[PDB]
Amino acid sequence: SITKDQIIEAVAAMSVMDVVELISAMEEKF
Amino acid sequence: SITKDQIIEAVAAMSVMDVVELISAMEEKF
Amino acid sequence: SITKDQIIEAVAAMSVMDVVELISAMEEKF
Amino acid sequence: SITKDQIIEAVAAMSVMDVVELISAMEEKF
Amino acid sequence: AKKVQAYVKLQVAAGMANPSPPVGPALGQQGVNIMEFCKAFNAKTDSIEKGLPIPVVITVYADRSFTFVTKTPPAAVLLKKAAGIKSGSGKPNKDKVGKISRAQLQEIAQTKAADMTGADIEAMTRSIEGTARSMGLVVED
Amino acid sequence: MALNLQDKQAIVAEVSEVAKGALSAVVADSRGVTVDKMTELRKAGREAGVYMRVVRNTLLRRAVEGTPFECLKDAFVGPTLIAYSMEHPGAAARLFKEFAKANAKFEVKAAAFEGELIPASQIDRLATLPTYEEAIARLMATMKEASAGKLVRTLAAVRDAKE
Ligand SMILES: [Mg+2]
């Protein structure tokens, strides 16, 4: 998919969701 | 929109797209 | 050998492909 | 390109060839 | 490893651990308890088998007892249970007393895998070769 | 010993260990203990063996007049006391580290590791060679590329962005 798409979502996608999201991906691999 | 379902399906964004996402993720943060 | 750039451009392979190419780059071991 | 082969041409290769490929990997991406 | 600090070796056989008449007040007198020489020893002695001589380091500081790291036995006493006579030399080279060969003493040199100055698994062969010739034993290699 | 003949001998051999040699290390040995031999020869039991030698032949006039096996830049590599370390079989890797971590434990000076042959020049201990047959350093080297270098920057904001 277009790089600009993952960003707009990984940057926008709230934070009440995001800080429970981007952190979850940090709790799955590595 | 989705969070982990698009991360599991993401799991791609070739290092081309990837490294560019990171780099262009710095055109907005850091 | 020295099939450099292309071999590397293969990162379109996407993450799982690499977890494969790394599993294989050792597996049947430790 | 097939991964299975992309691995064969590297596994039991010779150490000197590989280093000239690690560092050159550290300038491309990342 | 360092060098010197405390260590000796004066025993007869693992068959009778921590003896009194043979050694007694001679088995240790520097930081070693005569009665405490039957706890850390048999903790691994009676763990494999008793009979063969077992000397060992005597690492002593000032912390009450002592700590001994054991290893391998004398490859010379292996001629009373695994070769022949109950003795050894007696009548050395005045007559062809005993005789061992290439076959025997093989797995005797094999046991000492952490006690051999010869990475060459073949070189560490002629080392015990003499250990079975210090009494008058011919070799039928 | 012997004369000019014994001389040449030690050299041609010791210097064929530099011609046919896989590697080369020059280590000055002030206060060299026998434990010294008890080390490179212990690291020879279950990791090396007889594929290595280290004859203290700073005989110089010997080990040096006897490198017409092509060992230039070694006149500079002939100062004071040295204990030539030469490899025959096996990789050139591990042998270097052995001294690198020996002398750094005290174990006699290392002549600041004046460097030696194979690449051919001066002093500056590198780590090319010892990183071999540990290609899991190329497993970890890919840095998952798309993923590990990801979960470190693309995913490091949150754990450090809500300021
Ligand atoms: Mg001389």
TrEMBL record, chains A, B, C, D:
<comment type="subunit">
    <text>Homodimer. Part of the ribosomal stalk of the 50S ribosomal subunit. Forms a multimeric L10(L12)X complex, where L10 forms an elongated spine to which 2 to 4 L12 dimers bind in a sequential fashion. Binds GTP-bound translation factors.</text>
</comment>
<comment type="similarity">
    <text>Belongs to the bacterial ribosomal protein bL12 family.</text>
</comment>
<comment type="function">
    <text>Forms part of the ribosomal stalk which helps the ribosome interact with GTP-bound translation factors. Is thus essential for accurate translation.</text>
</comment>
<protein>
    <recommendedName>
        <fullName>Large ribosomal subunit protein bL12</fullName>
    </recommendedName>
</protein>
Automatic annotation (TrEMBL), chain E:
<comment type="function">
    <text>Forms part of the ribosomal stalk which helps the ribosome interact with GTP-bound translation factors.</text>
</comment>
<dbReference type="InterPro" id="IPR036769">
    <property type="entry name" value="Ribosomal_uL11_C_sf"/>
</dbReference>
<dbReference type="GO" id="GO:0022625">
    <property type="term" value="C:cytosolic large ribosomal subunit"/>
</dbReference>
<feature type="domain" description="Large ribosomal subunit protein uL11 C-terminal">
    <location>
        <begin position="71"/>
        <end position="139"/>
    </location>
</feature>
<dbReference type="GO" id="GO:0070180">
    <property type="term" value="F:large ribosomal subunit rRNA binding"/>
</dbReference>
<dbReference type="InterPro" id="IPR020783">
    <property type="entry name" value="Ribosomal_uL11_C"/>
</dbReference>
<feature type="domain" description="Large ribosomal subunit protein uL11 N-terminal">
    <location>
        <begin position="8"/>
        <end position="66"/>
    </location>
</feature>
<protein>
    <recommendedName>
        <fullName>Large ribosomal subunit protein uL11</fullName>
    </recommendedName>
</protein>
<dbReference type="GO" id="GO:0003735">
    <property type="term" value="F:structural constituent of ribosome"/>
</dbReference>
<dbReference type="InterPro" id="IPR020785">
    <property type="entry name" value="Ribosomal_uL11_CS"/>
</dbReference>
<keyword id="KW-0699">rRNA-binding</keyword>
<dbReference type="InterPro" id="IPR020784">
    <property type="entry name" value="Ribosomal_uL11_N"/>
</dbReference>
<keyword id="KW-0488">Methylation</keyword>
<dbReference type="InterPro" id="IPR000911">
    <property type="entry name" value="Ribosomal_uL11"/>
</dbReference>
<keyword id="KW-0689">Ribosomal protein</keyword>
Automatic annotation (TrEMBL), chain F:
<comment type="function">
    <text>Protein L10 is also a translational repressor protein. It controls the translation of the rplJL-rpoBC operon by binding to its mRNA.</text>
</comment>
<feature type="modified residue" description="N6-acetyllysine">
    <location>
        <position position="37"/>
    </location>
</feature>
<feature type="modified residue" description="N6-acetyllysine">
    <location>
        <position position="105"/>
    </location>
</feature>
<dbReference type="GO" id="GO:0006412">
    <property type="term" value="P:translation"/>
</dbReference>
<comment type="similarity">
    <text>Belongs to the universal ribosomal protein uL10 family.</text>
</comment>
<dbReference type="GO" id="GO:0015934">
    <property type="term" value="C:large ribosomal subunit"/>
</dbReference>
<keyword id="KW-0687">Ribonucleoprotein</keyword>
<dbReference type="InterPro" id="IPR002363">
    <property type="entry name" value="Ribosomal_uL10_CS_bac"/>
</dbReference>
<keyword id="KW-0694">RNA-binding</keyword>
<dbReference type="InterPro" id="IPR001790">
    <property type="entry name" value="Ribosomal_uL10"/>
</dbReference>
<dbReference type="InterPro" id="IPR043141">
    <property type="entry name" value="Ribosomal_uL10-like_sf"/>
</dbReference>
<dbReference type="InterPro" id="IPR022973">
    <property type="entry name" value="Ribosomal_uL10_bac"/>
</dbReference>
<dbReference type="GO" id="GO:0003735">
    <property type="term" value="F:structural constituent of ribosome"/>
</dbReference>
<dbReference type="InterPro" id="IPR047865">
    <property type="entry name" value="Ribosomal_uL10_bac_type"/>
</dbReference>
<keyword id="KW-0699">rRNA-binding</keyword>
